[PDB]
Design a protein around this ligand. Structure first.
Ligand SMILES: CC1=NN(C)C(=O)/C1=C(\O)c1ccc2c(c1)C(=O)N(Cc1ccccc1)C2=O
Ligand SMILES: CC1=NN(C)C(=O)/C1=C(\O)c1ccc2c(c1)C(=O)N(Cc1ccccc1)C2=O
Ligand SMILES: [Co+2]
Ligand SMILES: [Co+2]
Lengths: 380, 380
């Protein structure tokens, strides 16, 4: 059941912003590890004396990396005279975020029809304001409300290239890397208590819960067409193996974004290219499941994937799950930075053609138990 | 003239430590861009609840990348019970350094015969103490004094693998990258006033000045065998083009390390491999000199390099200078991070065989004027 109760018109995920200590080095690492191109910048060379911001793109996926300059460069500025291209940016907030949480996502940005109205409706329905609506060059409006922890939900709306004040980057500096990633599928938060988090966010967006004993309890909030998907996790305390959600909250100093799921148009090619680069600057992957997990694939998805395609899943360490409507291919990276906090998921979905409907195959919940039993091959 | 007046026995450069916000991402970028292998770690997986530290190596060159964890992980610790592997590390100092200066060098480490004696002699001769001598596992002694700005000179001495508490890294995680870089040749500081900086450092080391109108005044301090080379720059104010030394001091919030010069055993191969990677996660290089600069190479170094080797310098943008004893090949990267502060120099020296004596060919001073005149080809 989909009650289509969005309180304002939401389009698609627009971008994800990381707050960094040095945006250059993180952006360059991510570009090589994920196959994203450098497409826009806002920094000293563009007149921005406040923050350095670099945009990576792959298909429709947009990753923004921002770090503060010395406050001394902009000490004579006031908000009415700022050279910052992102008006919500604040030196003190960014340095406090990074010292507290380490490298992580500050903003989950969605494109809406009217960011001014989205903000006003959100706060009238309980959203905690973070940055009021600001009109950039009479062309784009940005506004921010609190989502969970120190993560904000950013509304962006366009009258009619990323943002005013950003520049297209040099062709020579923009190598056309591409490993197949195409869009953000979903973005997952970790909180200490699921109930209050869900009520708060669903309360100000109108997002509805999306149709679904180790580690977590979870639930997914979805927009009207179910293309914006925001799952939220809480720990389950007191078991034998310590909850990875609890470990996250300890090392992150509280609630924050846990993982970003990136859709690939060819997950076999994406993982081939990412795994080739794991030990030469890219990203590492969780340990692969045992061969018994793939011996058990035939009975569950043997009508969807060939034996060769199943053998191909086994080489790359890909996980497979199944809903009533679709099939899910997925895999998880090791943490993206120093702390055991944020990581990335690569996914591809098959089934549910109409365009493909959102969340086709779900989110992999059945893999927890399929892993444990397959990891009970300590007798073979 | 070399008075050989070192006040304690100095061996070689040992390592350079960067203070970072996220050591993982900077270490991975540098590894790919420079061709250095991951060789040691000290982090949560090794029992260190205080800082994450990753060591990259190429030949004898050692780059250390360190970032702080949340202080909450180690809140019950005291210095006598610390899990830190580098006893001088302090959460507050590191976060303050990074917020003030951005990504940069915290420590220039040299190996000595007795770091305890080096520290005591240094401070008896005016060195400002930073971290007292500490004995690690009865095997290694580390001590630190202030060098300039917030950069420290670190003494390391070994009774008889990097440091106790560091672990050798997995073979699968240690890809054997190598672009030819082999050791640190020299490390250069930028200060507001050269005179007082030289007197302070030469005063506590006994290092002697090494035998040598746009931008800077400079001088080089050298150890007894002239294998440890520490140049220092000051700005020249009031000219037409703004001093790059002054720009550094503004963006860095004062004195700090300006550049690291890395010796290559094959500078043609090093620059081939680095330039291939510039736009896919590695490092960018300053713009190459005009063809007239290389047309003028024949008359200055035509007895040292063939026309083909000169043509090869032109393809890679390599600069060439000449002393009375030797010849110098050199090139400079763009800044390593967000701020126009620290950069890297790649160098190879030819001449002065005995082993090669230190500073053979000098440091490239003649290139300033050879560039200006060659850049006066706006008439050809
Ligand atoms: C669940 C779920 N619900 N929702 C909304 C989601 O998006 C979602 C996942 O993405 C998801 C699905 C399957 C697995 C994991 C995550 C996972 O972490 N592991 C094992 C593991 C990997 C790395 C570190 C520690 C433990 C799995 O088997
Ligand atoms: C001098 C000198 N004295 N000592 C001890 C040294 O180590 C030393 C150099 O390394 C050195 C030698 C030649 C050049 C540069 C540095 C340099 O920066 N440029 C142009 C340029 C490059 C990048 C940004 C702005 C301007 C040169 O032509
Ligand atoms: Co997921
Ligand atoms: Co130099």
């Amino acid at each position: 059941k989909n009650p289509k109760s969005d309180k304002f018109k939401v389009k698609r995920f627009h971008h994800i912003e990381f707050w960094c200590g040095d945006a250059t080095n993180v952006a360059r690492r991510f570009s090589w590890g994920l196959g994203m191109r450098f497409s826009a910048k806002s920094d000293l060379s563009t007149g921005n004396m406040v923050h350095a911001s670099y945009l990576l793109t792959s298909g429709d996926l947009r990753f923004l990396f921002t770090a503060p300059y010395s406050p001394s460069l902009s000490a004579g500025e006031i908000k009415p005279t700022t050279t910052a291209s992102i008006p919500s940016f604040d030196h003190g907030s960014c340095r406090s975020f990074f010292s507290s949480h380490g490298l992580g996502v500050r903003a989950v940005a969605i494109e809406v029809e009217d960011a001014e109205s989205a903000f006003s409706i959100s706060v009238a329905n309980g959203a905690i304001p973070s940055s009021p609506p600001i009109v950039l060059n009479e062309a784009v409006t940005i506004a921010e409300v609190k989502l969970y922890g120190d993560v904000v939900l950013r509304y962006v709306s366009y009258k009619a290239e990323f943002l005013p004040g950003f520049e297209r980057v040099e062709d020579a500096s923009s190598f056309p890397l591409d490993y197949g990633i195409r869009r953000l599928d979903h973005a997952v938060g970790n909180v200490p208590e699921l109930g209050p988090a869900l009520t708060y966010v669903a309360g100000f967006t109108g997002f509805h819960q999306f149709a679904e004993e180790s580690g977590l309890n979870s639930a997914v909030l979805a927009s009207n067409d179910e293309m914006v998907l925001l799952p939220i996790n809480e720990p389950v305390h007191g078991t034998k193996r310590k909850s990875q959600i609890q470990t996250y909250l300890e090392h992150n100093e509280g609630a924050g974004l846990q993982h970003l799921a990136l859709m690939s148009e060819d997950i076999f090619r994406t993982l081939r290219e990412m795994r080739k680069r794991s030990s030469i600057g890219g990203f590492d992957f969780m340990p692969s499941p045992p061969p018994t997990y793939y011996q058990n694939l035939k009975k569950r998805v043997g009508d969807v994937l060939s034996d060769d395609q199943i053998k191909e899943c086994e080489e790359l360490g890909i996980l497979v799950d199944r809903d009533d409507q679709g099939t899910l291919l997925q895999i998880f990276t090791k943490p993206l930075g120093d702390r055991p906090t944020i990581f990335i998921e690569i996914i591809q979905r098959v089934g549910c053609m109409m365009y493909q409907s959102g969340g086709c195959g779900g989110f992999g919940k059945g893999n927890f138990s399929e892993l444990f039993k397959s990891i009970e091959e300590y007798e073979k």
